[PDB]
Write a protein that binds this ligand. Structure first.
Ligand code: ADP
Ligand code: BA
Ligand code: BA
Lengths: 337, 20
């Protein structure tokens, strides 16, 4: 039944995987309003689509920047995968297109802001609050993994909160369609599984590790492995010694020891029973998996929204001209975008 | 406290991906 849902999920995905959509809008169809967040290659803007009056979030990427950091393949992955998936907790790519200078991905605008923002402000999430979010990540990973995808960038900064208080996963920059192991050193330092750091070759288990980090950070208000510089963080991760807050439940601590498990033969999500080891853990006993999927659970926190266009849940950023050269940059490199 | 140590650290803001 999940097998059968997943089965037909995979058909839908593969069709799009094999024949991706391209060139579904253009720059002049949108008025650009405000920057919602910035990134290594550009920025994301609140925009308003002229003909419909809908708001969207427009991810702008400078092709030259992308090339410079050798992120071509990853960027192509990001778009190919994003246009192909369909899940309740995955942000929807609405349009995509390119011009002389930039790549554009236009997504649904997730107005509630980043989980980050909320987490740092509130301090930490109660275990029931944390569990609500975690459940959504679990189902999402079950979905992605089933398609031979690895996500590889779980963190509060990549999780948006929608108007119903549910999660929208964003940033597929490191997502990859892989059968078997892969080797790229990528992610975010606090969230890296030891086997990435150790340059061993790794698989989808790294996502389950990250889940542990996320759940810890959510419930604690700080990550299990932190320091001033990435290098000291990696030391800690590798040791894998973890200390828990006084307030963590026994059940939580037990779940965490099994996710933050250096031994792949022992890590939850990577065993014979797979995800069911997670879904069936005592920490999730009160969790209604179907109701979560169906968005019937009432959320613990609902962002204030006043109107379409409201960016109150978002930090302010400095703005800058979008520039489009008269000459085509990196045309061949980005042919399939 | 761990919290205090976290909060005094240089990594309380949005964290950058790496791709080394
Ligand atoms: N669909 C969206 N709705 C609202 N805000 C978004 C959306 N997508 C991205 N953002 C904002 O812009 C930031 C950067 O998006 P992201 O995809 O992570 O770019 P990058 O890969 O450069 O980090 C996000 O953390 C969030 O603040
Ligand atoms: Ba990001
Ligand atoms: Ba990215």
């Amino acid at each position: 039944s999940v097998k059968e849902f997943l089965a037909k999920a995979k058909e839908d995905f593969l069709k799009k995987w094999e024949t991706p959509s391209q060139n579904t809008a253009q720059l002049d169809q949108f008025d650009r309003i405000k920057t919602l967040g910035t990134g290594s290659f550009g920025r994301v803007m609140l925009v308003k689509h002229k003909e419909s009056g809908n708001h969207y979030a427009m991810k702008i990427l400078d092709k030259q920047k992308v090339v410079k950091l050798k992120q071509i393949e990853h960027t192509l992955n990001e778009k190919r995968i994003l246009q192909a998936v369909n899940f309740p907790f995955l942000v929807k790519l609405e349009f995509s297109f390119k011009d002389n200078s930039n790549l554009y991905m236009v997504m649904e605008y997730v107005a509630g802001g980043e989980m980050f923002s909320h987490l740092r402000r509130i301090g930490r999430f109660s275990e029931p609050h944390a569990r609500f979010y975690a459940a959504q990540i679990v189902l999402t990973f079950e979905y992605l993994h089933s398609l031979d995808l690895i996500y590889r960038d779980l963190k509060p900064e990549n999780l948006l909160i929608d108007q119903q208080g549910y999660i929208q996963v964003t940033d597929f920059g490191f997502a990859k369609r892989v059968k078997g192991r892969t080797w790229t050193l990528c992610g975010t330092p606090e969230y890296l599984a030891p086997e990435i750091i150790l340059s061993k070759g790794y698989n989808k288990a790294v996502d389950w590790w990250a889940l542990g980090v996320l759940i810890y950070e959510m419930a604690a208000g700080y990550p299990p492995f932190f320091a001033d510089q990435p290098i000291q963080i990696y030391e800690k991760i590798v040791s894998g010694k973890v200390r828990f807050p006084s307030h963590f439940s026994s059940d939580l601590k037990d779940l965490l020891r099994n996710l933050l498990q250096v031994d792949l033969t022992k890590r939850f999500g990577n065993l014979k029973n797979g995800v069911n080891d997670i879904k069936n853990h005592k920490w999730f006993a009160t969790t209604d998996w179907i109701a979560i999927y169906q968005r019937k659970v009432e959320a613990p926190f609902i962002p204030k929204f006043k109107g379409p266009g409201d960016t109150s849940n978002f930090d302010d950023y400095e703005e800058e001209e979008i520039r489009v050269s008269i000459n085509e940059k990196c045309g061949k490199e980005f042919t399939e975008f | 406290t761990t919290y205090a140590d976290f909060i005094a650290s240089g990594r309380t803001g949005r964290r950058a991906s790496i791709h080394d």
